[PDB]
Swiss-Prot record:
Disulfide bonds join 4-50, 14-27, 28-73, 48-87. It comes from Nicotiana tabacum (Common tobacco). Belongs to the plant LTP family. GO terms for biological process: defense response; lipid transport. The lineage of its organism: Eukaryota, Viridiplantae, Streptophyta, Embryophyta, Tracheophyta. Keywords: Disulfide bond, Lipid-binding, Pathogenesis-related protein, Plant defense, Signal, Transport. High expression in leaf epidermis and shoot apex, and also in root epidermis during seedling germination. GO terms for molecular function: lipid binding. It comes from the Eukaryota. This is Non-specific lipid-transfer protein 1.
């Protein structure tokens, strides 16, 4: 089943980039994998909420880099990675 636990494991390098402190490293590769588990409508919603939660979990989180993370790691996700956009209503 889909779960934030699996999603946050791939974010390990992103979590550091989100805080404007550690390099992206494999953040793009991790997210790239998630994208595939983030396009069947619900899989997508699970990732959005998990990521939103991930950003909210980070302490010195940079909202601009979070929202611009998928732009930095060019990926085909139809939602921005930020604790603000809702995903449950994404069709």
């Amino acid at each position: 089943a889909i779960t934030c636990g699996q999603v946050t494991s791939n974010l390990a390098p992103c979590l550091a980039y989100l805080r404007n402190t550690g390099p992206l490293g494999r953040c793009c590769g991790g997210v790239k994998a998630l994208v595939n588990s983030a396009r069947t409508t619900e899989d997508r919603q699970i990732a959005c909420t998990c990521l939103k939660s991930a950003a909210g979990a980070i302490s010195g989180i940079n909202l601009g880099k979070a929202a611009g993370l998928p732009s930095t790691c060019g990926v085909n996700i139809p939602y921005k990675i930020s604790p603000s956009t809702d995903c449950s209503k994404v069709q």
